[PDB]
Each structure stands twice: as C-alpha cells, then as structure tokens.
C-alpha cells in the first residue's frame, strides 16, 4: 500500500528551527510530486511547498519563502522540510502528500501529519488522576469511570483503555487550555455496573513530548 | 492567487438525505478541482478529483460537478460516517488553494443526557488543587447548559467545558464540565452540584454530592 | 461585522435540513440566496421568508 509518514514535529521557540521528514513507502517519490501542506486555526488548510524529485524543481508559498526549504533524498524515498525563523503563525499540523501518483492529478495520499507548536513556554508532563466509579456515576445498570489528565504542555496527549482492547463506550474529550497556559483533558468509559471490581480498567496515557507514560488503574472508592 | 469560496459553512441533515455543498473559484480553474473529507482526528482523504471523477474506493454516493467557476459536491444518501468536514482545492495555478470547509452534521432524534458527577480524587487532593467533573453522556442535540453550585452559590469563571464530536454509531454528543478550585476552598464547602438543562429533559437535572460522603 | 445567517431548507417531501452562512450581512445574504438558487435546480422553485431582520431564513422548495 502507499504510505507517507511524517516525523519531526514538536515544540520550538519563536525564532528557532525544526526539520520535518516525510518517509514514503509503496511507491517511488521519483514518480510523483511531493507536497507539504499545513493546517492551522488562522489559515485552515494552506499549501507550503512542493518538489518534483526527478528533476529537483521546487515551489514555495510566499509566506514561507526563504524561511523553509523542501528537499528530497530519493535513495531513502524520503522528503524533508527545513523550517527556520519560526513564528507563532507557523503553529500547525504539517502534512506531506503526493500528487500525480498513478496519473491522479490530486493529492491522493496524505500522512498522518505532525504537529509543530511555536511557543516560548516549556514542556510539562501531566498528572493522571482517576475518575473513580461510584454511586454518583451509575444509572440503568451501567457505570462511568475515567482518567483526568491535567496540566501538560504542549499537545498532544493520547489515551487508550486496557491497551486498546477496550474501545466501546469510550469518550476521550478534546483537551482544554487552562488559564495557566497548561492543557488538560479527561477520558471516560461506560461499562456494566456488575463488571466493576471483577474487570480491571486501566487508562494508558502517553505524552511523548515529556516522555510521560502512565498506565493508571481505576477502581471504585474504598470507604 | 485564486480563492475558493465554500458554502454553506455548516449543513445538518438526516441519514439518507441528499446533501449538496458548493465551492466557487475566483477565476477560471478549468476542472482542476478536488474534494477532500476530514473526519475527527484524521487527515484529509481524497473523494473527487478533476471536478467529477470518483477516487478509487470512495462510495458511489459521492459525486461532483462543475458549472463555470462553480463546483458542487453531492452526497446522495447521507450516512452516519459521513459526519465530517469537506474541503475543495484548485490546482490550476500555483499556489494550490483550499476552501474554508463545510462542516456536515447528522440530524437525529432528541436524547436526554445521562448526568454523572465525580469528586476530586484523593491523589489530586494531596497536592493543593481540586477538580470536580460533571459528565453529560450521549445526548442530542448539542446545545446544553451546565451550571455549577457550591453550597447553593452559583459559580462563575472557574469551570471549563469540553464536547466530543458526533459518536460513530449513535450520532450523539458527550460533554464534560470541570470545576477547578484550590484544595483549601474545596474543603471550605460541603455541597457540590452540577445542574444540567437540556431539550430532552422535562426539567433541569441536579447531580450533586457532599464532600466527604461515600 | 460578522453575522451568521441560519437557514431552514424545507423540501417538498417534508424533509428538513439546516445550514449556516457567515460573513458580513450582505455577503452571508448573497450566499444563502445563491445556494437556494442552486438547490432549486434539482428540488424545484424556492421561496425564502426572512424572519429576524434577515438573520434567519425559511427556504421552501416547490418540488
């Protein structure tokens, strides 16, 4: 299958530099154009740069010209985006995509995207607290429980339940930005009341920017 | 540069309906227009290219057409999994440019929320802050009012809401409201109450606990 | 300033959809009328009623 995988996004200070990679597989980038496209609150979807690896021709959006460079290493079937002199408005999800693959004159594969956060604030790992089931979180023979993932920076945080085996009834809320400048989110799951105390419930929290991995077991409260 | 003007910005229809969204180029782009879908937490996915041609693997209920500089995307029988954002893109001149997007929501019947409340955990309480979480599960429509009361006094400015997008099976929303206090203030009061107002409820629901009880 | 024009799209078979257009009042107005015209091609002639000083519309299609 055709696959594009971006890597390299992360926190960077205003004025700083970052380098993104786009590793392709299942086709040869010498046969297509490769583009970078970003997506941000202020501009939505916004094309950044393209390169035709066979001849090295490149084009750039006016707003990044001189600050970013696109390149490609065909021997590694990989393309790159050097980003210098970064500004707050460069904060975005950065996607790489192909164009002209198999004669299709559209961007028919996109990577999962990588998040670039331009800010002077520093990394901070979250605290993970249980949302314990109780008489105040049950009705109709089902019971809600969860995990509060509080005070982290920057995005993103991922949550799974029982190493991804538990997905039915899971709601992981979008993170909120607290007035402290730190993010916070909750993930809840609804389960049979009768399973509480026989079935183990664990939220697997990963915050890669701070190398925080937490596997928190959530149980009903003692008394 | 060429701009792509998409309308409506938001469209909400029932399962099975025919929905039509539009995109207008600011000058001639021939047929060099594509349409992308974006689902929650996802990357843009190609649906239609060159104005009218279906990308391989895309359900045939999607279709596109062109009329001069006006382009239309049609979903002939809206499915729950079509709940997503839709973007048009011209590639006729450099820079390629995208429309501002149309958000497509699914209509369904009213459903009142399950309302649950969670005191601060003991772990959190060891270190100076208390978060109180009110949970509204699986309701529709999205509009809802959550008010916090602490010992019967209405709270303002110390709570924050988060809302999921429409669920994959049942097209409902869920919502969390978190009340944040100092540990000191939390232990200074007794009754913590979440009051929920929603179209599916015959009158507002109050879910509360007394700090310290079991 | 920025306004949001809310629209009910009422089809002859009684199905109802809702849509929003945002922009200046004149931009949002022009876009709603243009969208109604386009839908009228497939769904029949439209009439548009304007409650709330124009900020809400009911757009019925003849079928």
């Amino acid at each position: 299958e055709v696959q594009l995988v971006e890597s390299g996004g992360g926190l960077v200070q205003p004025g700083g530099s970052l380098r993104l990679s786009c590793a392709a597989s299942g086709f040869n980038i010498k046969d297509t154009y490769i583009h970078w496209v970003r997506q941000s609150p202020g501009k939505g979807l916004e094309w950044v740069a393209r390169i035709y690896p066979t001849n090295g021709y490149t084009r750039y959006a006016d707003s990044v010209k001189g600050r970013f460079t696109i390149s490609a290493d065909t021997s590694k079937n990989t393309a790159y985006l050097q980003m210098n002199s970064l500004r707050a408005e460069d904060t975005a999800i950065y996607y790489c995509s192909r164009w002209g693959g198999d004669g299709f004159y559209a961007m028919d594969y996109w990577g999962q995207g990588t998040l670039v956060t331009v800010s002077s604030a520093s990394t901070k790992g979250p605290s993970v607290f249980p949302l314990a089931p109780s008489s105040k979180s049950t009705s109709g023979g089902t019971a809600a429980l969860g995990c509060l993932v509080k005070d982290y920076f920057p995005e993103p945080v991922t949550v799974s339940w029982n190493s991804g085996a538990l997905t039915s009834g899971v709601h992981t809320f979008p993170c909120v930005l607290q007035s402290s400048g730190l993010y916070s989110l909750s993930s809840v799951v609804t389960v049979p009341s009768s399973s509480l105390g026989t079935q183990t419930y664990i939220c697997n929290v990963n915050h890669k920017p701070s190398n925080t991995k937490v596997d928190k077991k959530v149980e009903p409260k003692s008394c | 540069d060429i701009q792509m003007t998409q309308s409506p910005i938001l469209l909400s229809a029932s399962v099975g309906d025919r929905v039509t969204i539009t995109c207008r180029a600011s000058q001639d782009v021939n047929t060099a227009v594509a349409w992308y879908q974006q689902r929650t937490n996802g990357s843009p996915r190609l649906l239609i290219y060159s104005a009218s041609f279906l990308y391989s693997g895309v359900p045939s209920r999607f279709s596109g057409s062109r009329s001069g500089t006006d382009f239309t995307l049609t979903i002939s029988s809206l499915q729950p999994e079509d709940e997503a954002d839709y973007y048009c893109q011209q590639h006729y001149t450099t820079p390629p440019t995208f429309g501002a997007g149309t958000k497509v929501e699914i209509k369904r019947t009213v459903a009142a929320p399950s309302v649950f409340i969670f005191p601060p955990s003991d772990e959190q309480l060891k270190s100076g802050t208390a978060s109180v979480v009110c949970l509204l599960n699986n309701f529709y429509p999205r509009e809802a009012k959550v008010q916090w009361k602490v010992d019967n006094a209405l709270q303002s400015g110390n709570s924050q809401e988060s809302v999921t997008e429409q669920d994959s099976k049942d097209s409902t929303y869920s919502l969390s409201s978190t009340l944040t206090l100092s540990k000191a203030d939390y232990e200074k009061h007794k009754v913590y109450a979440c009051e929920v107002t929603h179209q599916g409820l015959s009158s507002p629901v109050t879910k509360s606990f007394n700090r310290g009880e079991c | 300033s920025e306004v949001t024009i809310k629209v009910n799209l009422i089809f002859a078979d009684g199905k109802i959809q809702t849509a929003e257009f945002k922009g200046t009042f004149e931009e949002a107005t022009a876009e709603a009328y243009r969208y109604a015209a386009l839908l009228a091609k497939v769904n029949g002639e439209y009439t548009a009623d304007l409650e709330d000083g124009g900020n809400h519309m009911n757009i019925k299609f003849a079928g």
């Binding site: 995005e155 | 501002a100 958000k103 | -």
Partner: peptide, 12 residues
C-alpha cells in the same frame, strides 16, 4: 468555522 488543532475539526 474555526479549525481546531486538537480535534482536526471545524468548530462552528
């Protein structure tokens, strides 16, 4: 509407 980085969805 407003694109939201956390969800990758328009917020209307």
């Amino acid at each position: 509407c407003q694109f939201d980085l956390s969800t990758r969805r328009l917020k209307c």
